[PDB]
Amino acid sequence: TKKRRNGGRNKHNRGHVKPVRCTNCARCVPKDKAIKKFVIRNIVEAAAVRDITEASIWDSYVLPKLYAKLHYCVSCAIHSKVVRNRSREARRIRTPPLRSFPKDMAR
Amino acid sequence: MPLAKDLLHPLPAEEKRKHKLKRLVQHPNSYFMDVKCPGCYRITTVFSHAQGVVVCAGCATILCQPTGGRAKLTEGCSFRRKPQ
Amino acid sequence: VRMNVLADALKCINNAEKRGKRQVLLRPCSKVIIKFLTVMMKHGYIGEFEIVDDHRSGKIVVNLTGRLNKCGVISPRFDVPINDIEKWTNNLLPSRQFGYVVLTTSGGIMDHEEARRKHLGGKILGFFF
Amino acid sequence: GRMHAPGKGISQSALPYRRTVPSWLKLNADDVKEQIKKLGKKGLTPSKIGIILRDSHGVAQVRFVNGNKILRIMKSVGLKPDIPEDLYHMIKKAVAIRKHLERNRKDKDGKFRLILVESRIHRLARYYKTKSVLPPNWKYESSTASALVA
Amino acid sequence: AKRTKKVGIVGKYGTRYGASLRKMVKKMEITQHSKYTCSFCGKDSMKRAVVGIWSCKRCKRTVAGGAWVYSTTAAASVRSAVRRLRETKEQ
Amino acid sequence: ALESTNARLALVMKSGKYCLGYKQTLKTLRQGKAKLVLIASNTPALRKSEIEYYAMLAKTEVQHYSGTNIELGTACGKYFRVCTLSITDPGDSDIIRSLE
Amino acid sequence: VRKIRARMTDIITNEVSGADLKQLVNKLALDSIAKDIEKSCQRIYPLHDVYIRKVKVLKKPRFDVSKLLELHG
RNA sequence: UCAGAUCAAGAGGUAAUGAUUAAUAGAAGCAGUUUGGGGGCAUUAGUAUUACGACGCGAGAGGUGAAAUUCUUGGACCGUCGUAAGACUAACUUAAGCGAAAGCAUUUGCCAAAGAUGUUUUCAUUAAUCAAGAACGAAAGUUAGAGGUUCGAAGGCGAUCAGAUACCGCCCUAGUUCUAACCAUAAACGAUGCCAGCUAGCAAUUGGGUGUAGCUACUUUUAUGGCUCUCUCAGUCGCUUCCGGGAAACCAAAGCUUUUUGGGCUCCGGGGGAAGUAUGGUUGCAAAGCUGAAACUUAAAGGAAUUGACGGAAGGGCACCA
RNA sequence: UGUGCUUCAUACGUAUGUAAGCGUAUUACCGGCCGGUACUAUUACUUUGAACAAAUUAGAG
């Protein structure tokens, strides 16, 4: 049976939409059927940051951030546990939650 | 609401809102401009959603410009909306 | 497109009484369908309706009680003689106590009780009970 | 709606209930006779005469100021077109798709738009040959067509 | 009537040479022997004298053309390209 | 084939007077009767240059049409090819004031 | 978008034809185009941070140190 | 002459002297304002990946579960400026948009077309759906040229493994690329034909219109632009439950299929196999496509859900028979 | 051209369910209200008929 009203995602008024490549897997999965992670990361862990701001000649030199987007195969995002096996009533929730912590995945 | 039953006589600001077509009797949202352009005061009668530019006898410049909906007069058009 | 006005103003009645509204707007009132409601008006089922006269096709704002159960149309308009008028009351109407199948006989638009005494036959125009 | 397209959007004119208004008109009601045809002599199709007189005179609807329509007034003068207007413009479109296709081929979506407009010139021809404003023996042949509309 | 279902102008080589080389030469065997419309006076009179040279029976203009087609597509993409370099390098 | 003179030609082909060809055109241009001479793209350069030398002498303006022989004739309604026409009395068109 | 992209291409091609780089790099050392590419286009859309982001110098005219001594000295 | 009848009346005069509506049907227009990764052709940009040229460096480098194949006649890898070529158009990118569907994303020009909105424009039933027939139809495959970076079926090596014609790793071939043709199939899916009427909430957004001295950029405020709430069309999304329906999963349609019902049109199915086979016909260059049985066999095949089973299923926990 | 009024014939001041009188003329004559009588846009549908074997069937006795 039809497990989702979305199916993948967002395939309405398109017919067929472009694919991207997975990161860990290097698949060719649709752009919309894709776990996407716009990952912002500090370059220097923010725990070895005091070693680096010692060597900063300038005004302690506020650190640049790393920017990427993690297009994921579905079978290779469950495997890396970005997403997991929700309950059938928890399946329906999309926007909640942010609601966790300060800045995650950095650490 | 099982009793919107004054379809016979709705409140005239409600049907003012509705549409030109969706109401009980279709009716235009338009009118006619008896304009008095102060360059020369010969009165020309135009349509509001004009479907045509217009000249005058003396001040024959443009007097009206096309748009999507209501055609915009050229800011020196001392008009008065009237059924005369 | 509208291959019946009589279907697009009798389901529009029937869909608005199962929700229990007190007034239905029908469109666009062929004089076939006015004399269909006039059959239903004089048997109690329909209030005194109002015909808004815009000069395109017409609109009616029909009052109603709530006694109606299923007031539909038969299509296509099968020509029914008098001897096979009861094969269309048996399998259609709930019991022979009440209900009507409306006919367009050669004289006018009438139900199946007035036609079987006046001895007229015609086409089936719809039904209500 | 839209026999050849998906878009079911409704929009039209909403003509009011009152008929003989203008109650303010400057001249005779039937002096639009000598401005239907004086702008009919400038080659204007009656769609363009129905909106050039909305703004100068400015008449609202001709079939209430006079007795009958704009197309009937022009042939009462004698300015009826060689081909009626909703075929004159429907063919000038299908002409222009062919002139675009005699230089820009590889285009299978302007070609598709030609089969649409040609399948409905053949629907207005198939009707105008019944109501007898086009004679019989009148077809859409696309090799003579560009000298009709130009 | 129609005399051949499929060969057209290459029924003259009939049952000779194999079906593909008859099919292949037929594309060239039609455009050569065609009358192209003359691009100098307008008539359907621009026929081929020899390989590569085309001439018009009225107006008396001989042109230099392709082996079978009057103007090749590889040469009209040069006449375009040259005048869009001529537009830049002149003014 | 600009649609601003193709629309104006088809009015002179119903209301106007003209002469549709080269030898009738110089008949008009010698007679001081042409108002406007359209000439084709395709028309040869001597026939071109002596049309303009007559129109210099007869004060008629020459419009250079943007199409061949096959396209002036089509835009004149005709099933033949025109390379020269001289409009001598336009009825409804304002082809006199239409600039290039 | 295409109306401001029209407007961004005409002012900076009035700035670049602008008395060679001793004026021009001094403009981008002030970002003086970025304060006039901003206030002009806000008759079309209120625009965000404008960053000139890249300049290639794909062609170089001549070496000729007579034009370098007032440029370096 | 009456002329039984039958042609035409001295035609200029006496007849309200004759054209229904204009569909919240369609079509076409517009001084219309637009809008959209819609299609075509030119033009043009972006880094990247290669491959080479210089120059510095010094023995490693690719890769992987661990590897090896492989690259270093050291000048590789790496760093760097480069030149050249073919591809692909990121990020912005959405529950946005366009398109008949397949599909569509660097600007800029030109070309033709489209929905929608607006409209006291035009015509007057021109419309609805559809055997036959036509046009388009991802990818792959096929022809004939031009290309030929990346990738890569096939093939050739290295491992792993009892086996490994596989997964994993290396150079690669047809192909991907462009042109001119062919082919006509996809889970071509929303597994949901098209036009039409009705039936409800709630919130967002695409497009257009119209009142907000709502704000608001500044030529001075105004003209505009941006948004604000307030309407309004065509919707599309989203979520909540019907006076809904269904076997359920579930769905504002998949409801109004009442109490065997009825707006119209078209296509398809009748237990499972044998089988989309055989065969004939037709299309095709081929691959193959559109048609399409029976013999025999079979008491079940199947759908949505429930409890256990409690395994490369994630979660949270426990134990010296861990 | 849908009916309205005026009605009266007709179930009980009420009910026309047969009809008659105004919407300028629902077909011209003679007969004693009544007959001969001149004149009928169309088809589908429908009313009652005509017309035609019996046996069967329905079925009366």
Automatic annotation (TrEMBL), chain B:
GO terms for molecular function: RNA binding; structural constituent of ribosome; zinc ion binding. GO terms for cellular component: cytosolic ribosome; cytosolic small ribosomal subunit. Binds 1 zinc ion per subunit. GO terms for biological process: cytoplasmic translation; ribosomal small subunit assembly; translation. The keyword rRNA-binding does not apply. Its cofactor is Zn(2+). Keywords: Metal-binding, Ribonucleoprotein, Ribosomal protein, Zinc, Zinc-finger. Signal peptide: none annotated. Belongs to the eukaryotic ribosomal protein eS27 family. This is 40S ribosomal protein S27. The lineage of its organism: Eukaryota, Metazoa, Ecdysozoa, Arthropoda, Hexapoda.
Automatic annotation (TrEMBL), chain F:
InterPro entries: Ribosomal_eL30 (IPR000231), Ribosomal_eL30-like (IPR039109), Ribosomal_eL30-like_sf (IPR029064), Ribosomal_eL30_CS (IPR022991), Ribosomal_eL8/eL30/eS12/Gad45 (IPR004038). Residues 6-96 form the Ribosomal protein eL8/eL30/eS12/Gadd45 domain. It comes from the Eukaryota. Pfam families: Ribosomal_L7Ae. The keyword Ribonucleoprotein applies. The keyword Ribonucleoprotein applies. SUPFAM superfamilies: L30e-like. GO terms for molecular function: RNA binding; structural constituent of ribosome. GO terms for biological process: cytoplasmic translation. GO terms for cellular component: cytosolic large ribosomal subunit; cytosolic ribosome. Keywords: Ribonucleoprotein, Ribosomal protein. NCBIfam families: PRK01018.1. HAMAP family: Ribosomal_eL30 (MF_00481). Belongs to the eukaryotic ribosomal protein eL30 family. This is Large ribosomal subunit protein eL30. It comes from Drosophila melanogaster (Fruit fly). The gene is RpL30.
